[PDB]
């Protein structure tokens, strides 16, 4: 089994800083581990539980693997988690001022016994603190950085762009780069940085690694790199949608001309499946109106709206029924096209089929439940439309159904 001393018998969360030091000394003796400095883990039991095995490994390369697994054994035996926040820190870390971040450091040292960290170690506001990675926390404070990061993640669980800098960072000029440093300085309450430190253009700036940012500006470097990466994620998402709306317009014309191969190519690259023109037409509208049966089926597979209405109120079923494309009607009906859809003038698909004398479509519409008694704004049923046209064949089938 596992045997523990009396002074360490208590649960690890309640351990004092001295208890944690005695645990390392006891661990080294019991397991013949390489001698460990008492200062390697200057924290209480509550802070120790926050550490991941990675942090244990980094603090002690030789015995960090064993110490973590040994601590995990103790934790299993007993059957950090609850943190009390002061009023000034009850605000969400996003809204924290730079003074709030300094107070958070002071409270963390009191709550978890930690080596004193200067307020200038994290000279930034709450927004910048969230950007920093765990490695940045360790670099700024080796003794307490990892604990602070894990503490911040627990609190969390429990980008405005200036117009002149709206453009992509690749095209940033030398003057634009300096303004980005200034705007970031006031936005994140960073320490002011000289323009000479980053004497380069936007395309030159992108080459730099994260270490280059920390070398040129120790105080604000890591924030600036993480900020630049967030912009690129924003721009990539921004430009990806602007390219999709332009490919959607190409899909509208490609679905109008019957370009089967080009439609699949545009769809594969992210063209909008439900793109709309000025008249309100979608790629499914135009393909159905012009009888491109093959294109209609691929659009349905990619998620095009079968019952979408344009500005006039005409659904794809209306266009397919009016132009006499019987095959497309059956496919649309299968994908749950509305048989009784009304356009602005009150014409159901049955009305349009009767208006242009497509007898085969009329039978299919009546079979799928199209309303015979439905009336348009002129108070005319589909049967009435056929009488004026003179289509005796269509009229006879309608006349039978009262």
Numbering used by the authors: 1 to 79, 84 to 162, 172 to 415
Paper text:
A pH-sensitive mutant of the polymer-forming sterile alpha motif (SAM) domain of human translocation ETS leukaemia (TEL) protein (TELSAM) was previously engineered. It was then shown that genetic fusion of a panel of target proteins of interest to this TELSAM protein polymer could consistently achieve their crystallization. (i) The long TELSAM polymers are expected to confer increased avidity to any weak crystal contacts made by fused target proteins, allowing crystallization of a greater fraction of proteins. (ii) The regular spacing of target proteins along the sixfold helical TELSAM polymer is expected to pre-programme much of the symmetry and spacing of the resulting crystal lattice.
In a related pilot study, we explored whether TELSAM could scaffold a DARPin for potential use with conformationally heterogeneous target proteins. We chose a DARPin orientation that would allow it to non-covalently bind a second target protein using the DARPin's canonical binding surface while minimizing clashes between that second target protein and the TELSAM polymer. Thin plate crystals appeared in 3 days under various conditions, diffracting to around 3.2 Å resolution. All inter-layer contacts occur solely between DARPins from adjacent polymer layers. Inter-DARPin contacts bury only 147 Å2 of solvent-accessible surface area and involve a single salt bridge between Lys 368 on the canonical binding surface of one DARPin and Glu 275 on the back side of a second DARPin. Tyr 369 appears to stabilize the position of Lys 368. Since this is a DARPin–DARPin contact, each DARPin makes two such contacts to other DARPins from the adjacent polymer layer. The weak inter-DARPin crystal contacts and vertical displacement of polymer layers may also explain the observed diffraction limits, growth defect and scale factor of the thin/short axis of the crystal. Taken together, these observations suggest that the avidity of the inter-layer, inter-DARPin contacts was sufficient to stabilize these otherwise weak interactions.
